[PDB]
């Protein structure tokens, strides 16, 4: 069995362990990965505005 260790200092995981099955060979959506993060690249806009 093969494992990958992850860490976050975030608080709600204080002494909390979660574990599940993931696949490290596919980058594409498939019914066999725990979750997929659909990401749209994002850009900013800068302009001058009047408000009240």
């Amino acid at each position: 069995y093969d494992y990958t260790i992850a860490r976050i200092s975030d608080l709600r995981m204080k002494d909390k362990i979660v574990m599940t099955f993931i696949l490290p060979n596919e980058s594409e959506p498939h019914p066999l990965q725990h979750g997929v993060l659909g990401f749209i690249p994002e850009y900013l806009v800068d302009f001058n505005m009047i408000r009240n």
């Binding site: 302009f47 505005m49 009047i50 408000r51 009240n52």
Partner: protein
């Protein structure tokens, strides 16, 4: 309080007229004459006792 790019077009023109001469013709019942048996409006000319 919302911003959006706009294209403004404000024309300024006026039609000036000089010549005080104009000729107009009005035609009516163009439909009917083609549609109807419009024939010679012959002028029977008053040769019998009426004159």
């Amino acid at each position: 309080q919302r911003i959006g790019r706009e294209i403004r077009l404000t024309p300024r023109y006026r039609y000036f007229n000089f010549l005080p001469i104009m000729l107009v013709i009005n035609v009516i019942n163009l439909e009917e004459a083609i549609a109807q048996r419009t024939a010679l409006d012959v002028n029977e000319t008053q040769v019998t006792p009426a004159s």
